[model samples]
Target: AQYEDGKQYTTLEKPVAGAPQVLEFFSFFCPHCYQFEEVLHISDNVKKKLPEGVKMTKYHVNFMGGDLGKDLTQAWAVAMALGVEDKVTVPLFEGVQKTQTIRSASDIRDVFINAGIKGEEYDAAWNSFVVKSLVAQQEKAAADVQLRGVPAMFVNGKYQLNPQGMDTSNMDVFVQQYADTVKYLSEK
Candidate 1:
């Protein structure tokens, strides 16, 4: 479907940088994203089984409720900008889901701090221009993609709407599918 400006989607001009980039579009308050979290480790396992150069990029969507959702998305971007994405992504998700208490930016900041990110660094990143840019980019991308929900995975620019599309739900299955998809696309 064509993107509907100001409502449907954001325009993401940049294509996936590398071949077989596993692009995942998600949101902080999305229960499905949380569900997918338990299975993301499979991507790591698959890494060991695949050829090198394949990469995974996560894009957090910010169009669910309101400013709170946007704040959470910005928080993720802050973590990424601060070079603590690996350290804080899962922890933030776990904290939000487990506690059901992501009401404001402060809530997310606290989570990042608890995840071992230096409080000072988190504060700086939270307010940095880079983080603001990411947040704006996310808003644009969400509109361009015409995303209606979170936890949507796009493999090589194609949306994986079905769990069966990847051929796995478990850790092993998820990894194998990711590796296979990368290999298949790379050879094409």
Candidate 2:
């Protein structure tokens, strides 16, 4: 069986350069992305199940939070730069989506602090050249994808998964099918 180009997936006009890579476009404020993280644990599961050396890079889109959207995107990059995504991503998601507790950069900084990152360390990564570059890259990639929604996933830079087209009634079936599609696309 083959996935349809327009329905199940779409070939990118500007294909993400790295093969064997999965790029996820999400927003901290999106309820669905939060569900994917909390309820399904989709990214973590898929990451463990991905073929060796096939990596997943998450790109936060700057289209959700009005003026705070860009800040959240930068915050995401800072988390990655500090290698604390495991700590920050979920809490931030909870604050923004579930609890409505996160509003400003200072609030975000607090999450990092609770995650064991000092205030100064958070500031440094927030202003560091690399993280800034990553922020810009993430925003640009999201724009290039002309993304219609958050929690959108593209595998091997080319095949964007259609969750609507997947069997998602059960977690086991969903993860296996998702990983299988990712593996299939990576090999392609």
Candidate 3:
């Protein structure tokens, strides 16, 4: 992701993978970024909004930097790669918010277990070689971009937009601004 004059989104010089027309660099624990999976409905959102030439993606950031942060980030990458994010996202966010239960694998295990996804699906992705590789890619990508914060977007893998100052005083306004920006950038 790139920025221009610290005010607007800018273009990238060397692109990162999954640059898609719209890419989200997010964090599960970020209050404002919570529930994007449900809102985006990801795959369909991709089909409807992402052009054929681009590939949209959502990568959870480890910027907070702690065992908890790393764990949650790993959990997110695995959860999404396993295609169970929709089923587990809200609970994970709410769990972290209300109970502060994301400190260890036990907590995360309960999330998947409660989502009705046990053993195989959980084990395969959580322990899979590929998931770790993708997570590593995210680490490198985040480094390349030097993300100073979370809840950001990378449009065309070249421009970075932090949804800040987007006029989201209320739910309706935020939703409106979100859609408006999506169209505005997707068209660019």
Candidate 4:
């Protein structure tokens, strides 16, 4: 399932109707994504100032390989399947950003455990069909959007590539514009 413009959101179902919709694409292992996390959270604060119909949807973009990206993807998929993204996203972000430990599947499991998600449920969700499906969907999205790097955000569906096309110094401004774009798009 995928979101269709002006049509029913089949997959990635989130509160979009009557609200400005924000879809952020990010990866766990990317340093820029890590930095953008704080900004993105702050953007939510900006959203609060908007007219009551603004919502943000986070999509964990995975194009990297190795244990780190894989584990992070596993954790994200599990959280989404369990409908606990809000509960676990911060912890997952902290697990990678605040710690010096190598980010791996085990590290993500520990993060989930610390976030009050039971180990058994975490393991089950990691291996579930939903998670696998999301992983596939993420890959497709990356290719379709022509993502050149991590932390590439899409305002409604438009890519917010930086002027350098490889820098994030303008992330704060991008996020602000993103909010404004969402506000405008949802009105039409």
The prediction achieving the highest TM-score against the true structure is 2
Tens-digit lDDT track of model 4 for 64-165: 647677767767878888888877776777667667454568877887788788888988888888889987766666665566677654444443423232
Give the distance in Å from residue 177's predicted Cα in candidate 4 to where it truly belongs: 3.9
Which regions of candidate 4 fall more than 4 Å away from where they truly are?
1-21, 39-55, 158-175
Q: Judged by lDDT relative to the true structure, which candidate is superior, 1 or 2?
A: 2
How much does each candidate deviate from the true structure in C-alpha RMSD?
A: 6.8, 2.0, 4.2, 7.7
Give the poorly placed runs of model 1, Cα more than 4 Å off.
1-20, 39-42, 45-50, 158-161, 164-175
Per-residue lDDT, model 4, residue 1, is: 21
Error of 1 at 119 (Å): 2.6
Each model's lDDT: 0.63, 0.81, 0.67, 0.61
Off by over 4 Å in 2: 2-7, 18-20
Per-residue lDDT tens digits of candidate 2, residues 95-153? 88878888898888888999899889999999899998999888777766677888988
Residue 152 displacement (Å), model 3: 0.7
lDDT of 1 at 125: 82
Candidate 3 wrongly placed segments (more than 4 Å): 1-18, 35-55
Q: Pick the candidate with the highest lDDT.
A: 2
What is the TM-score ranking, best to worst? 2, 3, 1, 4
lDDT of 2: 0.81
